Amino acid sequence: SMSYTWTGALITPCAAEESKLPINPLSNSLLRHHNMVYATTSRSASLRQKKVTFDRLQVLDDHYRDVLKEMKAKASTVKAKLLSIEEACKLTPPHSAKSKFGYGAKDVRNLSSRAVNHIRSVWEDLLEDTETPIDTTIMAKSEVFCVQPEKGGRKPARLIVFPDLGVRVCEKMALYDVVSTLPQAVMGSSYGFQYSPKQRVEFLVNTWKSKKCPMGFSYDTRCFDSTVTESDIRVEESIYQCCDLAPEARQAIRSLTERLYIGGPLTNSKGQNCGYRRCRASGVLTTSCGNTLTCYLKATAACRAAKLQDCTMLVNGDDLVVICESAGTQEDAAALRAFTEAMTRYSAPPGDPPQPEYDLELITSCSSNVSVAHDASGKRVYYLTRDPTTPLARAAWETARHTPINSWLGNIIMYAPTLWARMILMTHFFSILLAQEQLEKALDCQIYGACYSIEPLDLPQIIERLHGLSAFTLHSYSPGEINRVASCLRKLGVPPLRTWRHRARSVRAKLLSQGGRAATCGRYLFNWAVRTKLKLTPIPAASQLDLSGWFVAGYSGGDIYHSLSR
């Protein structure tokens, strides 16, 4: 079966697309080699289409069947709730793509009669029609990156496939509780999204330390969404049906599976038929949960076929990492070859073959790795970091153009204890917000796929809560880390680290001479910059009235919004 079939009609943009980082009079503040930065457009969609289109061969065995059963036994434990129309409407983001039927996201969140009436008709139709394929729109996504080491090497745009706004609200009524609760019930501590960065590190380290003689490797599949088969999607549904569910929820799930999740027709922004899909749609509520369960299922069965000792896995969508008991250098290498052969049989071949690693700091997963620094007292602290190239390019682009979503904010949040995030990101953006007086204006950013509204004045509290005060006192970063960061700054033309120390004291001062939330930002966010460092004490409001539901599950491609955690 082919992952996609194409008619020849083109994948079209619904509006003008910027590809080059226009000559900004402030982004230079950050980076000078503009030509290194680019955004993907519709123009490279055909290149992506050829990467993503191929026949899938899949052969299942006893290990696969044993593991599926164990998963279903755990899922049987779950009781899921049907969301009411109102609750599902509130989860919709304010700028979600409007409906083909004459109402938008503003209308849905306001519970307008025309929106609610169309939403009900969609719901009833899921009960009355068990089989007609549901329409979806295919689009080229606009994402920014830094040019490939092979100068001129560029990533073609990724493709996003999604049903109408009305269908998306119904997916939430039937499946939001399921997608937010079942992964953890089935996968235990192996479910990645239940962890904040601080917790993910803790789990990686204790697990590594749990081994007598550790071995580990990251495994990334080549175009995972396209490797997902009709069979995989139906197995996913068999796991969801093990929950206790209301009858209408049960039928909605059955209909959604057959009419949308397994495949359907592709329509461009002009209303023309582009072709047909028989693999995972990247923009449905179930894609994170579905990919996570499917990845876990195939990998767990693969270790058994390969006979790997005491494997513990950590899965986030298609990102997989595993740490087992080493059995000898030669042994290990041959076990992976085996593991890859089994994954391949299960319809999940790798992009780059995996490599056994015997140093935890060398494993890269979710585009990140564990590194080591020291805190105030000097007690080796572990934390998560990543190559900063993409984050810095995106921050440059966001300085020059107002984007709906601000990755820089999410990056400060998720990587606040990092060297680059503190010296560069915090300094650059707080000077800017200072300049325009936007410390109040809340900004939209996203964590693990969900869109969250956050007011920059609350970062100190958020950071303390997630990372602990160590994040405000780390200091003797590793050499490999400092080298990677400085090498990245040269590549892009970002001013050397020692330069930022200077701008920091300035901003910091302008923030203290401000008081309120402003002043506290100045005290904790820039303590590393002051010559006379002070002793930071736990924040009041922070470690108290702070909201959660932040690290429960992944919602990438899911159209999920929460405007909480101020």
Curated annotation (Swiss-Prot):
Regulation: Activity is up-regulated by PRK2/PKN2-mediated phosphorylation.
All residue ranges annotated as the RdRp catalytic domain in the record: 214-332
Effect listed in the UniProt record for changing C366R: In strain: Isolate pCV-J4L2S
Positions contributing to Mg(2+) 2 binding: D220, D318, D319
Catalyses which reaction(s): RNA(n) + a ribonucleoside 5'-triphosphate = RNA(n+1) + diphosphate
Binding note for cofactor: Binds 2 magnesium ion that constitute a dinuclear catalytic metal center.
Protein location: Host cytoplasm; Host endoplasmic reticulum membrane
Cofactors named for this entry: Mg(2+)
Annotated phenotype, changing I405V: In strain: Isolate pCV-J4L2S
Phosphoserine: residues carrying this PTM: S29, S42
Post-translational modification comment from the UniProt entry: The N-terminus is phosphorylated by host PRK2/PKN2.
Membrane topology reported for the UniProt record: Single-pass type IV membrane protein
Source superkingdom: Viruses
Quaternary structure and partners: Homooligomer. Interacts with non-structural protein 5A. Interacts with host VAPB. Interacts with host PRK2/PKN2. Interacts with host HNRNPA1 and SEPT6; these interactions facilitate viral replication. Part of the replication complex composed of NS2, NS3, NS4A, NS4B, NS5A and the RNA-directed RNA polymerase.
Function: RNA-dependent RNA polymerase that performs primer-template recognition and RNA synthesis during viral replication. Initiates RNA transcription/replication at a flavin adenine dinucleotide (FAD), resulting in a 5'- FAD cap on viral RNAs. In this way, recognition of viral 5' RNA by host pattern recognition receptors can be bypassed, thereby evading activation of antiviral pathways.
Protein name as it appears in the record: RNA-directed RNA polymerase
Species the sequence originates in: Hepatitis C virus genotype 1b (strain HC-J4) (HCV)
